[PDB]
Design a protein around this nucleic acid. Sequence first.
RNA 1: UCGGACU
Length: 191
Amino acid sequence: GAMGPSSVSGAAPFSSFMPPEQETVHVFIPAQAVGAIIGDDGQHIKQLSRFASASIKIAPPETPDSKVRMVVITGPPEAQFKAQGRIYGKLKEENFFGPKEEVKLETHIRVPASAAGRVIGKGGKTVNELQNLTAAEVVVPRDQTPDENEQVIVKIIGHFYASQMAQRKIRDILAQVKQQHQKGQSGQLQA
RNA sequence: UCGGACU
């Protein structure tokens, strides 16, 4: 509903719209915590957009899991690190579940189905390593349960410092797997 | 040494 005639035609058609084809993570916070993030004039979450340099979209009560709300963080690692830690710490400052409890969010990151059992380490090894030492609990889907685009989602349950280290290591191994797949023997023992 | 677990 923007009926702008646009009669002005400059040699430089400055397009004010931006396509968020950036790295998109989905992390959810309890519905009570959503009130703290969104509640501030209903724009503080949208402030995160420019602040974290990302396209911030908030989930309405659409999905049956509406006991929580999934936030759509579309942006580079800049936004991933900034927004994720920002909201994570925000749950702490808001004295919801911070002084008497540790904030435990679930970050969904994009992993290829062909590497689902790879990011979990050599048989749930990354879970043991990251949970015990880093306090980052990493969980994968049962076997894979893949999307047609061979997409699976792996969850990070922990704390800001842990989650960042975990998601970095996961994508670290992950990326190098796909590279090894391409620049190698694909996935067969022929020679 | 690239498998599958832990919820």
